[PDB]
């Protein structure tokens, strides 16, 4: 047993090649309409794979206008989150994703003008594997 | 209480359903009659003297005699020319008929037990002052006869052929002549008789 965590501390963010360094929280999920089809023979049902669907969210707090004047154009994410305990760093790129909705506008009180997306991604690719 | 009861007559045998008919039994009636529009009045309804043909349609299922014997058995009676009883006792009725359409089905669990989907048909017999013949004639008997002491020809035709003067159609048979002495009129006790048909 040792510590070799991570934390998101280390998370490195490039949307579309530019470091969004203000993002606080982000999470993707590549998720796979799998059906599942009951046989005669078989006691237990069988579960197929389907095509898979890429999503993700994304929300920080506000320092500009990049997400309203960006619009529904599409873009890149690039998440690198690096070890800092031991060398060794993941590193993933969603290929193709697109805003669902434009966080237009955002503000309550005198808290901070946090700001949230979400939208989808076509794939992914793989580039370090820890 | 509901009970379905299908005594069958021409095989001897009297099928109970192990299982309810599921959601709902229906029965409907629709009295016979066909529109004429005259002029200058418009439509009128004139009712036709004869009865309808009804079914009674209902699905149960058969869990785990077997299913697969119970099916077989049902998907014979289907073929069977000769009617079906079937009474069922809550709903409240008795009477002969027949089954149009009949289905079993195995589902992906379950696979022992057997869905059946049944429908059937009123039966109603073609006789093709002085009583009626209202009465259903659906008794059976063996194909072949074992004489009794008490027993004639005459009587056993009467018993199991009808008319009683039938008799000549049962010893004009050759095995009938052969087991039966060349007198008609002497019949001897255990041997076998067959009636034609």
């Given at each position: 047993e040792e510590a070799s965590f991570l934390n998101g501390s280390d998370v490195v963010i490039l949307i579309d090649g530019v470091e969004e360094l203000y993002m606080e929280e982000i999470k993707a999920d590549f998720e796979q309409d799998e059906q599942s089809i009951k046989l005669l023979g078989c006691q237990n049902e069988i579960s197929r794979v389907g095509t898979t669907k890429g999503s993700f969210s994304l929300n920080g707090y506000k320092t500009d206008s990049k997400f309203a004047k960006l619009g529904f154009r599409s873009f890149e994410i690039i998440y690198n989150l690096s070890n800092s305990e031991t060398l060794g760093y993941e590193s993933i790129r969603l290929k193709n994703c697109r805003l669902k909705?434009?966080?237009?506008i955002n503000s309550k009180a005198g808290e901070i003008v946090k700001i949230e997306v979400e939208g989808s991604f076509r794939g992914y690719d793989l580039l370090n594997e820890l | 209480v509901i009970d379905i009861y299908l005594k069958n007559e021409k095989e001897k045998i009297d099928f109970h359903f192990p299982v309810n008919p599921q959601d709902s039994l229906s029965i409907k009636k629709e009295k016979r009659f066909e529109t004429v529009d005259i002029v200058n009045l418009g439509e009128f309804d004139i009712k036709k003297e004869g009865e309808k043909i009804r079914e009674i349609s209902f699905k149960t299922f058969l869990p785990n005699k077997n299913p697969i014997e119970v099916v077989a058995m049902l998907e014979k009676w289907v073929d069977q020319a000769e009617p079906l009883r079937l009474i069922i006792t809550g709903f409240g009725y008795n009477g002969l008929v027949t089954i149009s359409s009949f289905s079993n089905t195995q589902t992906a669990?379950?696979?022992?037990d057997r869905d059946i989907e049944i429908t059937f048909r009123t039966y109603r017999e073609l006789k093709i002052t002085d009583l009626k013949d209202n009465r259903p004639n659906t008794q059976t008997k063996s194909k072949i006869y074992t004489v009794k002491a008490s027993d004639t020809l005459y009587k056993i035709a009467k018993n199991l052929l009808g008319k009683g003067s039938r008799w000549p159609e049962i010893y004009n048979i050759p095995e009938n002549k052969k087991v039966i002495g060349?007198?008609?009129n002497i019949i001897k006790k255990g041997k076998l008789v067959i009636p034609s048909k």
């Open positions: 909705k434009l966080p237009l | 669990g379950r696979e022992e060349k007198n008609p």
